[PDB]
Amino acid sequence: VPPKIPDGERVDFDDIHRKRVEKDLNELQTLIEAHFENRKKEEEELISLKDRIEKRRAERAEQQRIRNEREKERQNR
């Protein structure tokens, strides 16, 4: 014979609130917080660091030009 489920009390369709409404606001707020903190940590620091590395690169370029010119001056024979 097919199984017979013993009779209980309750409930159903009442956990949809407690599993939906929670993340309906908490998840949105938490993801907004994550996006804000990630953008703040990432974008400005990356642009500033790239500018810093660019300045160091320009200084390296100047040093390379000076050394190349002095060595070409001496070695030119």
Partner 1 sequence: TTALVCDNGSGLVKAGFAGDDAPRAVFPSIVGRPRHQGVMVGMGQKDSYVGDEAQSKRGILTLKYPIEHGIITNWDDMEKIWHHTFYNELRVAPEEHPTLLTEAPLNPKANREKMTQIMFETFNVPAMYVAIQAVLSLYASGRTTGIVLDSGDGVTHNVPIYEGYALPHAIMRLDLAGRDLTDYLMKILTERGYSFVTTAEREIVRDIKEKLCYVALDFENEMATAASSSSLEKSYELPDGQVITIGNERFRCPETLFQPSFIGMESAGIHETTYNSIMKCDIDIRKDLYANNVLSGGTTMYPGIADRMQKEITALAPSTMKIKIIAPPERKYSVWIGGSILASLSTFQQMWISKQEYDEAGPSIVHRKCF
Partner 2 sequence: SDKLKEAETRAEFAERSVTKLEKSIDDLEDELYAQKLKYKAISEELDHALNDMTSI
Chain residues that interact with partner 1, rule: CB under 8 A: 1-6, 8-9, 12-13, 15-16, 19, 23
CA dist list (Å): 53 to 3, 60, 72: 73, 10, 28
Query: What is the rounded CA–CA span in Å between residue 44 and residue 38?
Result: 10
C-beta of 2 vs 77, nearer to partner 1: 2
Tokens of 13: 């369709």
Q: Select from partner 2, partner 1, none the partner in contact with residue 35, using the beta carbon and a kind-dependent cut-off of 5 to 8 Å.
A: partner 2
C-beta of 61 vs 66, nearer to partner 2: 61
Q: What is the largest CA-CA distance in the chain?
A: 107
> Binder to partner 2 among 22, 33, 37, 43 (CB under 8 A)?
43
Residue owning tokens 């320009």: 58
Q: Closest distance between partner 1 and the C-beta of residue 27, in Å?
A: 10
